[PDB]
Amino acid sequence: CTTYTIKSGDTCYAISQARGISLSDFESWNAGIDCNNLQIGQVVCVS
């Protein structure tokens, strides 16, 4: 897991798209993450 910290206006889709990964793979690395309720400062895996 490469970590990334959620910033204002971030979405799981935009994070995935910017890194050239599928949103499904991103979800598989992020244990039931709630993509419609992200918190500023939340830490996610991007690899």
Report the binding-site residues for Zn(2+): 25, 27, 34, 36
Tell me which residues touch Zn ion (CB under 5 A): 25, 34, 36-37
> If you write DSSP's letter for every residue of 8-24 in order, what string do you get?
TT--HHHHHHHHT--HH
- Cβ 9 to Zn ion, closest distance in Å? 17
Q: How far is the CB of 36 from Zn ion (least distance, A)?
A: 4
Q: What is the token pair recorded at 21? A: 């990964």
Q: Using the minimum distance from each CB to Zn ion, give the nearer residue, 5 or 22.
A: 22
Which residues are documented as binding site? Answer: 25, 27, 34, 36
Q: How many Å apart are CA 44 and CA 47, to the nearest integer?
A: 9
